[PDB]
């Protein structure tokens, strides 16, 4: 049997892409993911995870990583939830090796709902298992999670080489906050690396205009 795991990175940041990654591993290769301790990789530094990333690739039968830029996210036709479901499906449907069973991180507050909707969007037969924090539960999802996180960090790293210190890209991050406030104060607009619909932008813009003297 072929087992697939699928997760996402970059859900709530205001800057950068959202990355959805799907991995496929043969049953016999599952112990390898445990050997790699993919489940205990949350505390790893980006460089150590990159090494893990490369190791994971060596045991996978197949994988798909979709890097969705802020332009794509912003032009979406549906809600962000629908967007996530839609792209999880696209990633799985793009796989060369079709999984018999799919383990997915439940984006939707309703795990059952997510599994149902994802499956209805697949163009092949498979059992879909969706759970909250599935990445702490199933090593195969943990693996996908690592591919998505690494891809996402690489993306932001590339952005820093072009815009300087932009932080992690999350509004909660002081550097990301300052970067956006200062850029708006200097240009009266936000850079083309932000997600146009994020409420964070409106608040920063209003704050900045408030200061003006």
mmCIF file of C-alpha atoms in Angstrom:
data_model
loop_
_atom_site.group_PDB
_atom_site.id
_atom_site.type_symbol
_atom_site.label_atom_id
_atom_site.label_comp_id
_atom_site.label_asym_id
_atom_site.label_seq_id
_atom_site.Cartn_x
_atom_site.Cartn_y
_atom_site.Cartn_z
ATOM 1 C CA UNK A 1 0.000 0.000 0.000
ATOM 2 C CA UNK A 2 0.990 3.587 -0.683
ATOM 3 C CA UNK A 3 0.356 5.989 2.179
ATOM 4 C CA UNK A 4 0.135 9.740 1.685
ATOM 5 C CA UNK A 5 0.433 12.636 4.104
ATOM 6 C CA UNK A 6 -0.474 16.244 3.343
ATOM 7 C CA UNK A 7 -0.093 19.447 5.327
ATOM 8 C CA UNK A 8 0.263 23.202 4.976
ATOM 9 C CA UNK A 9 2.639 25.953 6.057
ATOM 10 C CA UNK A 10 2.070 29.694 5.904
ATOM 11 C CA UNK A 11 -1.608 29.799 6.758
ATOM 12 C CA UNK A 12 -1.788 32.997 8.796
ATOM 13 C CA UNK A 13 1.166 35.181 7.706
ATOM 14 C CA UNK A 14 0.450 38.496 5.960
ATOM 15 C CA UNK A 15 3.637 38.184 3.871
ATOM 16 C CA UNK A 16 4.604 35.318 1.607
ATOM 17 C CA UNK A 17 3.224 32.132 0.067
ATOM 18 C CA UNK A 18 1.122 29.361 1.543
ATOM 19 C CA UNK A 19 2.739 26.005 0.864
ATOM 20 C CA UNK A 20 0.828 22.755 0.547
ATOM 21 C CA UNK A 21 2.885 19.595 0.420
ATOM 22 C CA UNK A 22 1.779 16.033 -0.284
ATOM 23 C CA UNK A 23 4.083 13.054 0.218
ATOM 24 C CA UNK A 24 3.685 9.408 -0.698
ATOM 25 C CA UNK A 25 5.490 6.596 1.071
ATOM 26 C CA UNK A 26 5.208 2.871 0.619
ATOM 27 C CA UNK A 27 4.142 1.004 3.753
ATOM 28 C CA UNK A 28 7.498 -0.752 4.000
ATOM 29 C CA UNK A 29 9.244 2.631 4.125
ATOM 30 C CA UNK A 30 7.117 4.052 6.942
ATOM 31 C CA UNK A 31 9.530 2.923 9.682
ATOM 32 C CA UNK A 32 12.128 5.166 8.041
ATOM 33 C CA UNK A 33 10.070 8.244 8.903
ATOM 34 C CA UNK A 34 10.105 7.142 12.528
ATOM 35 C CA UNK A 35 13.854 6.532 12.276
ATOM 36 C CA UNK A 36 14.143 10.149 11.136
ATOM 37 C CA UNK A 37 12.065 11.288 14.115
ATOM 38 C CA UNK A 38 9.986 13.545 11.866
ATOM 39 C CA UNK A 39 7.432 13.901 14.671
ATOM 40 C CA UNK A 40 10.010 15.610 16.914
ATOM 41 C CA UNK A 41 11.145 18.233 14.411
ATOM 42 C CA UNK A 42 9.144 21.266 15.539
ATOM 43 C CA UNK A 43 11.999 22.602 17.674
ATOM 44 C CA UNK A 44 14.624 22.190 14.937
ATOM 45 C CA UNK A 45 16.387 25.186 13.426
ATOM 46 C CA UNK A 46 15.705 25.851 9.718
ATOM 47 C CA UNK A 47 19.159 24.550 8.744
ATOM 48 C CA UNK A 48 18.724 21.288 10.641
ATOM 49 C CA UNK A 49 15.252 20.827 9.174
ATOM 50 C CA UNK A 50 16.635 21.421 5.694
ATOM 51 C CA UNK A 51 18.917 18.450 6.326
ATOM 52 C CA UNK A 52 15.915 16.450 7.562
ATOM 53 C CA UNK A 53 14.012 17.634 4.472
ATOM 54 C CA UNK A 54 16.655 16.169 2.172
ATOM 55 C CA UNK A 55 16.670 12.929 4.171
ATOM 56 C CA UNK A 56 12.891 12.619 3.903
ATOM 57 C CA UNK A 57 13.048 13.022 0.133
ATOM 58 C CA UNK A 58 15.236 9.932 0.026
ATOM 59 C CA UNK A 59 12.553 7.625 1.396
ATOM 60 C CA UNK A 60 9.488 9.032 -0.376
ATOM 61 C CA UNK A 61 7.992 7.329 -3.444
ATOM 62 C CA UNK A 62 6.643 10.667 -4.648
ATOM 63 C CA UNK A 63 5.748 14.168 -3.461
ATOM 64 C CA UNK A 64 4.205 17.436 -4.609
ATOM 65 C CA UNK A 65 4.855 20.868 -3.156
ATOM 66 C CA UNK A 66 2.620 23.757 -4.171
ATOM 67 C CA UNK A 67 3.945 27.213 -3.350
ATOM 68 C CA UNK A 68 0.961 29.572 -3.584
ATOM 69 C CA UNK A 69 2.110 33.237 -3.742
ATOM 70 C CA UNK A 70 0.235 36.186 -2.158
ATOM 71 C CA UNK A 71 -1.084 37.091 -5.615
ATOM 72 C CA UNK A 72 -2.739 33.697 -6.034
ATOM 73 C CA UNK A 73 -4.117 33.645 -2.499
ATOM 74 C CA UNK A 74 -5.533 37.133 -2.971
ATOM 75 C CA UNK A 75 -7.242 36.331 -6.275
ATOM 76 C CA UNK A 76 -8.952 33.233 -4.849
ATOM 77 C CA UNK A 77 -12.623 32.651 -5.745
ATOM 78 C CA UNK A 78 -13.592 31.123 -2.412
ATOM 79 C CA UNK A 79 -13.044 31.460 1.315
ATOM 80 C CA UNK A 80 -9.562 30.681 2.599
ATOM 81 C CA UNK A 81 -10.940 27.348 3.872
ATOM 82 C CA UNK A 82 -12.296 26.489 0.426
ATOM 83 C CA UNK A 83 -8.946 27.614 -1.019
ATOM 84 C CA UNK A 84 -7.091 25.199 1.254
ATOM 85 C CA UNK A 85 -9.397 22.274 0.444
ATOM 86 C CA UNK A 86 -9.132 23.048 -3.273
ATOM 87 C CA UNK A 87 -5.348 23.063 -3.222
ATOM 88 C CA UNK A 88 -4.945 20.004 -0.987
ATOM 89 C CA UNK A 89 -6.949 18.240 -3.710
ATOM 90 C CA UNK A 90 -4.803 19.697 -6.514
ATOM 91 C CA UNK A 91 -1.635 18.493 -4.779
ATOM 92 C CA UNK A 92 -2.972 14.975 -4.292
ATOM 93 C CA UNK A 93 -4.408 14.825 -7.818
ATOM 94 C CA UNK A 94 -1.038 15.877 -9.231
ATOM 95 C CA UNK A 95 0.727 12.896 -7.628
ATOM 96 C CA UNK A 96 2.313 10.360 -9.986
ATOM 97 C CA UNK A 97 1.989 7.579 -7.417
ATOM 98 C CA UNK A 98 -1.591 7.523 -6.151
ATOM 99 C CA UNK A 99 -1.973 6.848 -2.425
ATOM 100 C CA UNK A 100 -4.420 4.196 -1.183
ATOM 101 C CA UNK A 101 -4.871 6.043 2.108
ATOM 102 C CA UNK A 102 -4.447 9.764 2.746
ATOM 103 C CA UNK A 103 -3.737 11.361 6.125
ATOM 104 C CA UNK A 104 -4.424 15.080 6.208
ATOM 105 C CA UNK A 105 -4.129 17.851 8.747
ATOM 106 C CA UNK A 106 -7.699 19.076 9.310
ATOM 107 C CA UNK A 107 -7.744 22.739 8.313
ATOM 108 C CA UNK A 108 -11.497 22.884 9.021
ATOM 109 C CA UNK A 109 -12.755 23.044 12.625
ATOM 110 C CA UNK A 110 -14.780 20.000 11.540
ATOM 111 C CA UNK A 111 -12.462 17.081 10.710
ATOM 112 C CA UNK A 112 -15.270 15.025 9.176
ATOM 113 C CA UNK A 113 -16.305 17.927 6.948
ATOM 114 C CA UNK A 114 -12.738 18.430 5.717
ATOM 115 C CA UNK A 115 -12.263 14.743 4.886
ATOM 116 C CA UNK A 116 -15.570 14.642 3.014
ATOM 117 C CA UNK A 117 -14.911 17.773 0.965
ATOM 118 C CA UNK A 118 -11.310 16.835 0.154
ATOM 119 C CA UNK A 119 -12.297 13.378 -1.018
ATOM 120 C CA UNK A 120 -15.093 14.766 -3.174
ATOM 121 C CA UNK A 121 -12.452 16.806 -4.991
ATOM 122 C CA UNK A 122 -10.068 13.919 -5.745
ATOM 123 C CA UNK A 123 -10.046 12.288 -9.174
ATOM 124 C CA UNK A 124 -8.954 8.850 -7.872
ATOM 125 C CA UNK A 125 -10.115 6.375 -5.188
ATOM 126 C CA UNK A 126 -8.595 6.585 -1.705
ATOM 127 C CA UNK A 127 -9.507 6.631 1.983
ATOM 128 C CA UNK A 128 -9.134 10.105 3.478
ATOM 129 C CA UNK A 129 -8.308 10.553 7.162
ATOM 130 C CA UNK A 130 -8.324 14.127 8.454
ATOM 131 C CA UNK A 131 -7.367 15.170 11.982
ATOM 132 C CA UNK A 132 -6.441 18.313 13.879
ATOM 133 C CA UNK A 133 -2.684 18.549 14.540
ATOM 134 C CA UNK A 134 -2.322 15.479 12.330
ATOM 135 C CA UNK A 135 1.379 16.403 12.085
ATOM 136 C CA UNK A 136 1.892 15.427 15.739
ATOM 137 C CA UNK A 137 -0.057 12.214 15.118
ATOM 138 C CA UNK A 138 0.974 10.650 11.814
ATOM 139 C CA UNK A 139 4.669 10.573 10.835
ATOM 140 C CA UNK A 140 3.638 10.693 7.186
ATOM 141 C CA UNK A 141 1.835 14.004 7.748
ATOM 142 C CA UNK A 142 4.762 15.216 9.846
ATOM 143 C CA UNK A 143 6.956 14.582 6.792
ATOM 144 C CA UNK A 144 4.663 16.627 4.518
ATOM 145 C CA UNK A 145 4.611 19.354 7.167
ATOM 146 C CA UNK A 146 8.414 19.486 7.053
ATOM 147 C CA UNK A 147 8.448 19.847 3.265
ATOM 148 C CA UNK A 148 5.922 22.687 3.485
ATOM 149 C CA UNK A 149 7.648 24.506 6.344
ATOM 150 C CA UNK A 150 11.081 24.320 4.711
ATOM 151 C CA UNK A 151 9.657 25.501 1.382
ATOM 152 C CA UNK A 152 7.932 28.373 3.138
ATOM 153 C CA UNK A 153 11.007 29.456 5.096
ATOM 154 C CA UNK A 154 13.121 29.331 1.936
ATOM 155 C CA UNK A 155 10.560 31.601 0.292
ATOM 156 C CA UNK A 156 10.703 34.227 3.039
ATOM 157 C CA UNK A 157 14.493 33.964 3.096
ATOM 158 C CA UNK A 158 14.487 34.836 -0.602
ATOM 159 C CA UNK A 159 12.231 37.800 0.155
ATOM 160 C CA UNK A 160 14.640 39.099 2.805
ATOM 161 C CA UNK A 161 17.429 39.228 0.232
ATOM 162 C CA UNK A 162 15.193 41.613 -1.720
ATOM 163 C CA UNK A 163 13.432 43.640 0.993
ATOM 164 C CA UNK A 164 15.711 43.249 3.997
ATOM 165 C CA UNK A 165 14.503 42.098 7.413
ATOM 166 C CA UNK A 166 10.786 41.420 7.042
ATOM 167 C CA UNK A 167 10.515 39.074 10.013
ATOM 168 C CA UNK A 168 8.745 35.720 9.816
ATOM 169 C CA UNK A 169 5.937 37.330 7.858
ATOM 170 C CA UNK A 170 3.371 36.931 10.635
ATOM 171 C CA UNK A 171 1.694 40.090 12.015
ATOM 172 C CA UNK A 172 2.563 39.009 15.562
ATOM 173 C CA UNK A 173 6.248 39.369 14.660
ATOM 174 C CA UNK A 174 7.710 42.794 15.667
ATOM 175 C CA UNK A 175 10.041 42.914 12.655
ATOM 176 C CA UNK A 176 7.234 42.098 10.232
ATOM 177 C CA UNK A 177 5.094 44.776 11.910
ATOM 178 C CA UNK A 178 7.763 47.482 11.762
ATOM 179 C CA UNK A 179 8.749 46.526 8.224
ATOM 180 C CA UNK A 180 5.177 46.974 6.997
ATOM 181 C CA UNK A 181 4.524 50.167 8.959
ATOM 182 C CA UNK A 182 7.740 51.783 7.730
ATOM 183 C CA UNK A 183 7.217 50.678 4.136
ATOM 184 C CA UNK A 184 3.701 52.120 4.149
ATOM 185 C CA UNK A 185 4.893 55.340 5.757
ATOM 186 C CA UNK A 186 7.548 55.604 3.030
ATOM 187 C CA UNK A 187 5.487 54.510 0.020
ATOM 188 C CA UNK A 188 1.895 55.060 1.087
ATOM 189 C CA UNK A 189 1.228 51.490 -0.013
ATOM 190 C CA UNK A 190 2.330 47.950 0.805
ATOM 191 C CA UNK A 191 4.918 45.896 -1.113
ATOM 192 C CA UNK A 192 3.780 43.203 -3.607
ATOM 193 C CA UNK A 193 4.582 40.399 -1.149
ATOM 194 C CA UNK A 194 1.568 40.901 1.113
ATOM 195 C CA UNK A 195 -1.824 39.186 1.018
ATOM 196 C CA UNK A 196 -4.113 42.027 -0.059
ATOM 197 C CA UNK A 197 -7.017 40.852 2.079
ATOM 198 C CA UNK A 198 -5.258 40.555 5.431
ATOM 199 C CA UNK A 199 -6.951 42.729 8.052
ATOM 200 C CA UNK A 200 -3.448 43.434 9.348
ATOM 201 C CA UNK A 201 -2.821 45.766 6.412
ATOM 202 C CA UNK A 202 -5.893 47.923 7.044
ATOM 203 C CA UNK A 203 -4.915 48.364 10.703
ATOM 204 C CA UNK A 204 -1.312 49.278 9.864
ATOM 205 C CA UNK A 205 -2.418 51.752 7.195
ATOM 206 C CA UNK A 206 -4.900 53.412 9.551
ATOM 207 C CA UNK A 207 -2.319 53.533 12.321
ATOM 208 C CA UNK A 208 0.278 55.175 10.068
ATOM 209 C CA UNK A 209 -2.130 57.784 8.688
ATOM 210 C CA UNK A 210 -3.078 58.516 12.310
ATOM 211 C CA UNK A 211 0.493 59.481 13.187
ATOM 212 C CA UNK A 212 1.061 61.875 10.255
ATOM 213 C CA UNK A 213 1.856 65.411 11.412
#
